[PDB]
Amino acid sequence: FYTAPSTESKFTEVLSKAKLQYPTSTTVAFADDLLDGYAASYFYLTSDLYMQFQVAGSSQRSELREMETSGDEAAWDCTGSTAHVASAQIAIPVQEDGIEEVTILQVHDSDVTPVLRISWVSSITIDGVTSEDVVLATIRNGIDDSTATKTVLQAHTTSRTEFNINVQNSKLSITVDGTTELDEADISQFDGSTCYFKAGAYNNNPTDTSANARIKMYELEWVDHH
Numbered sequence: 001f002y003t004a005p006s007t008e009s010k011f012t013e014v015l016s017k018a019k020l021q022y023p024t025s026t027t028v029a030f031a032d033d034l035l036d037g038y039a040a041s042y043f044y045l046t047s048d049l050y051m052q053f054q055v056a057g058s059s060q061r062s063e064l065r066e067m068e069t070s071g072d073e074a075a076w077d078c079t080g081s082t083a084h085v086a087s088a089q090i091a092i093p094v095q096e097d098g099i100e101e102v103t104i105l106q107v108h109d110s111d112v113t114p115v116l117r118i119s120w121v122s123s124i125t126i127d128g129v130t131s132e133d134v135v136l137a138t139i140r141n142g143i144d145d146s147t148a149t150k151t152v153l154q155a156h157t158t159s160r161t162e163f164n165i166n167v168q169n170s171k172l173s174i175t176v177d178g179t180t181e182l183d184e185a186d187i188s189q190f191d192g193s194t195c196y197f198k199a200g201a202y203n204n205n206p207t208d209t210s211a212n213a214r215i216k217m218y219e220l221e222w223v224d225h226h
């Protein structure tokens with residue numbers, strides 16, 4: 001009894017350009033499955049036309065992974081001259097108790113390193129400054145450097161919010177409701193890597209492994225320009 005996001009034509013293109021992973025990195029629905037009405041408790045269309053992702057457990061996910069319409073996985077030069085842009089309208093609800101961080105958008109390399117995570121966090125301390133209930137950008141300092149550079153982007157609101165990630169020429173920028181919140185951060189540490197976008201709910205370090213993280217997307221798309 002779940003309505004498929006594919007029933008809304010605003011999602012047809014991105015679903016044609018995606019596959020769905022759940023609850024780990026195994027694909028449960030390819031683009032053709034998604035376009036043919038795939039729906040489940042963890043991925044469905046709400047009555048007010050949000051594509052909602054929901055998942056419980058440590059490091060579990062319900063996430064779309066960027067694909068080419070050809071069925072090739074997206075694997076663009078992370079630092080190349082072609083601009084790659086992801087845009088999304090996202091409504092982050094109040095997370096259930098025990099949910100401490102939920103990653104909603106990523107630039108991920110073609111191995112095991114997230115270039116960029118945009119995530120909601122219950123708390124974060126960045127150079128002696130503690131912020132509570134915010135949206136955060138985390139950019140890994142390298143494949144061999146586990147550390148990352150973190151930047152508060154927005155105070156969490158339940159309101160629908162426009163996010164835009166623009167990646168071009170060794171730099172990455174993020175806008176939130178049209179306002180630049182991260183201005184050409186350097187990602188040259190991923191020279192020689194290939195990259196792709198992801199969107200959904202990725203549940204990081206919950207304290208209640210039973211609680212559900214939940215994220216709603218009113219619009220979502222990813223493109224390139226040559």
Ligand SMILES: O=C(O)[C@H]1O[C@@H](O[C@H]2[C@H](O)[C@H](O)[C@H](O[C@H]3[C@H](O)[C@H](O)[C@H](O)O[C@@H]3C(=O)O)O[C@@H]2C(=O)O)[C@@H](O)[C@@H](O)[C@@H]1O
Nearest residue numbers: 059113114117124125126138140146147148149150204205
């Ligand atoms: O505030 C810090 O910078 C904090 O980060 C700690 O390492 C983090 C790292 O910053 C980053 O958040 C990373 O993110 C993970 C993510 O949680 C998830 O597991 C994903 O699958 O992979 C991401 C990744 O590998 O980058 O998680 C690290 C973590 O240990 O939680 C430390 O550097 C810490 O000293 C520092 O205060």
Ligand SMILES: O=C(O)C1=C[C@H](O)[C@H](O)[C@H](O[C@H]2[C@H](O)[C@H](O)[C@H](O[C@H]3[C@H](O)[C@H](O)[C@H](O)O[C@@H]3C(=O)O)O[C@@H]2C(=O)O)O1
Nearest residue numbers: 021024025026027065073106108110111112113114117202
């Ligand atoms: O998503 C993360 O932020 C996360 C960070 C960890 O440090 C790892 O990097 C981990 O990366 C995932 C990654 O996000 C993809 O889900 C990936 O999926 C691939 C798998 O190999 C699948 O089995 C499939 O065959 O192709 C997928 C693809 O590349 O699109 O798996 C890794 C991972 O779990 O190591 O998560």
